[PDB]
Structure formats: structure tokens, C-alpha cells
């Protein structure tokens, strides 16, 4: 792991690394890069 950013075209691309990351199903697409947002 040392990619820092994640890039995507729609959220849907953007659970599957942060869940990696995070361990939870919880991202978002926003300017073409994943927010990870993590667990509750």
C-alpha cells in the first residue's frame, strides 16, 4: 500500500479498496477520487 489516491468514475468503484483500507462498505465518489469514510 502506497497509492494515496483511490480514482474512480462512480462510487460504486470506490467500495471495494476502501473496504480493503477500512475493513467497512462506506465511500464516495467526489471528483473523480474515493472518500473512505470509514466505520462505525
Same mark, same amino acid.
Given at each position: 500500500?502506497? /497509492?494515496?489516491?483511490i480514482r =474512480?468514475?462512480g462510487t460504486r468503484? =470506490?467500495?471495494?479498496? =476502501? ?6 462498505l +462506506?465511500?464516495?465518489c467526489? +471528483?473523480? /477520487? =474515493?472518500?473512505c469514510?470509514?466505520c462505525?
Amino acid at each position: 500500500g502506497s /497509492a494515496e489516491i483511490i480514482r =474512480c468514475s462512480g462510487t460504486r468503484e =470506490c467500495y471495494a479498496p =476502501c473496504q480493503k483500507l477500512t475493513g467497512c462498505l +462506506n465511500a464516495k465518489c467526489m +471528483n473523480k /477520487a =474515493c472518500k473512505c469514510y470509514g466505520c462505525v
